[PDB]
Amino acid sequence: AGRRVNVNVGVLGHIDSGKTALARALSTTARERGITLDLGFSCFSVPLPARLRSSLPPGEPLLQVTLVDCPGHASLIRTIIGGAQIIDLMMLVIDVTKGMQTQSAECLVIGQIACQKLVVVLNKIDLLPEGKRQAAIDKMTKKMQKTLENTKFRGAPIIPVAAKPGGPTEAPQGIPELIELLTSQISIPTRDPSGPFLMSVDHCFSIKGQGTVMTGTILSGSISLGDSVEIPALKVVKKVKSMQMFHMPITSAMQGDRLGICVTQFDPKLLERGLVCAPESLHTVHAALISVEKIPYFRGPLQTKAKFHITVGHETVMGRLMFFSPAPDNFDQEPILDSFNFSQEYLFQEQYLSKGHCPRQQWALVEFEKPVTCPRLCLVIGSRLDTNTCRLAFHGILLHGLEDRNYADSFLPRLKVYKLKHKHGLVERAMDDYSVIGRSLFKKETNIQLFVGLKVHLSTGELGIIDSAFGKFKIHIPGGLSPESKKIEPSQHVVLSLTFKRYVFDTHKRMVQS
Ligand SMILES: Nc1nc2c(ncn2[C@@H]2O[C@H](COP(=O)(O)OP(=O)(O)CP(=O)(O)O)[C@@H](O)[C@H]2O)c(=O)[nH]1
Ligand SMILES: [Mg+2]
- Pairing type for strands 274-277 and 198-206 reads antiparallel
Resolution of the coordinates, Å? 2.7
Strand partners, 383: 309, 392
- Assess contact for 505 and 511: CB atoms under 8 A: yes
Experimental method: X-ray
Ligand 1 binding pocket includes 38 (Cβ within 6 Å): no
Q: How far is the CA of 162 from the centre of ligand 1 (A)?
A: 10
Question: Residue 190 annotated as binding?
Answer: no
Residue 67 CB neighbours (<10 A): 24
User: First and final CA of the chain: distance in angstroms?
Assistant: 73
Q: How far is the CA of 44 from the centre of ligand 1 (A)?
A: 21
C-alpha dist (Å) from residue 78 to 311, 381, 477: 8, 10, 62
**Ligand 1 atom at minimal distance to the Cα of residue 32:** 16
- How far apart CA 330 and CA 332 sit, in angstroms, is 5
DSSP characters for 46-91? EEPPGGGGGG---PPPEEEEEEEEPP-SGGGHHHHHHHHTT-SEEE
- How far apart CA 46 and CA 49 sit, in angstroms, is 9
Ligand 1 binding pocket includes 74 (Cβ within 6 Å): no
- Assess contact for 276 and 201: CB atoms under 8 A: yes
- How far apart CA 158 and CA 141 sit, in angstroms, is 6
Q: How far is the CA of 104 from the centre of ligand 1 (A)?
A: 15
> How far is residue 239 CA from its own chain's centroid?
32
Q: How far is the CA of 11 from the centre of ligand 2 (A)?
A: 9
Strand, helix or coil for residue 252 = strand
Question: Residue 126 annotated as binding?
Answer: yes
Task: Let me know if 484 is exposed, middle or buried by CB neighbors in 10 A (0-12, 13-18, 19+).
Answer: middle
- How far apart CA 186 and CA 46 sit, in angstroms, is 12
- How far apart CA 235 and CA 214 sit, in angstroms, is 16
- How far apart CA 14 and CA 94 sit, in angstroms, is 7
Question: Residue 304 annotated as binding?
Answer: no
Residues 6+ apart with CB under 8 A from 150: 296
Pocket test for ligand 1, best of 11, 20, 103 (most atoms within 8 A of CB): 20
For residue 28, what is the domain's CATH number? 3.40.50.300
- How far apart CA 99 and CA 141 sit, in angstroms, is 10
The single-letter DSSP state of residue 330 is G
Question: Residue 18 annotated as binding?
Answer: yes
Any idea which ligand is nearest the CA of 33? 1
Q: Please state the φ and ψ torsions of residue 243, each to the nearest 5 degrees.
A: -140, 125
Ligand 1 binding pocket includes 35 (Cβ within 6 Å): yes
DSSP characters for 377-421? T-EEEEE-----S--EEEEEEEEEEE-STTHHHHTGGG-EEEEEE
Task: Name the residue at shortest CA distance from atom 1 of ligand 1.
Answer: 167
User: Can you give the residue range of the structural domain that contains 138?
Assistant: 4-185
Among 233, 235, 232, 240, which Cα is nearest to 211's? 240
Among 337, 367, 374, which Cα is nearest to 502's? 367
Strand partners, 213: 205, 262
Question: Residue 215 annotated as binding?
Answer: no
